[PDB]
């Protein structure tokens, strides 16, 4: 409930920055906003890709840490390690 709320707020902020920065590089804006032009399921998939160190996702460290902590708590609840 709150993880998605903060993720949505950040995606609004990044889109605002993209729109404000569109006027300096139009060619960049294409692949820069392909993320916002991607389907919502693909958006979820690409923003939830900070597992491992591939790090192509635009998710910031502060939002990443909350999910990395909740995943550890869930794994402990499941008794995995």
């Amino acid at each position: 409930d709150d993880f998605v709320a903060k993720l949505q707020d950040n995606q609004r902020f990044r889109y605002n920055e993209v729109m404000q920065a569109l006027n300096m590089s139009a060619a960049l804006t294409a692949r820069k906003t392909k993320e916002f032009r991607s389907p919502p399921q693909e958006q979820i998939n690409m923003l939830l890709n900070f597992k491992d160190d591939k790090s192509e996702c635009p998710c910031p460290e502060e939002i990443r840490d909350q999910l990395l902590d909740f995943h550890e708590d869930l794994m402990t609840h499941c008794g995995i390690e």
Binding site: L7, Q41, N49, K51, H71, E81
Partner: protein, 67 residues
């Protein structure tokens, strides 16, 4: 291209729909990919003859749980 532009990013979507999408994406991206090795311990614990002489057998060796 304006048709792709107008299509709503996640921040326009209602909270519950985005939550459902996040649940699905989290499932595939994290829950499926997470792996732990337990077979070598499970098949060992099952194969262990459990205290058959300690508890009252007084007969042929009872089949182990794996058996």
């Amino acid at each position: 291209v304006v048709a792709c532009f107008r299509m709503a990013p996640l921040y326009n979507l209602p909270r519950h729909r985005a939550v459902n999408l996040f649940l699905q994406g989290y499932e595939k991206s994290w829950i499926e990919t997470e792996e732990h090795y337990f077979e070598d311990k499970l098949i060992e614990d099952l194969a262990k003859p459990g205290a058959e002489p300690p508890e009252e057998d007084e007969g042929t060796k009872r089949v182990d749980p794996l058996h």
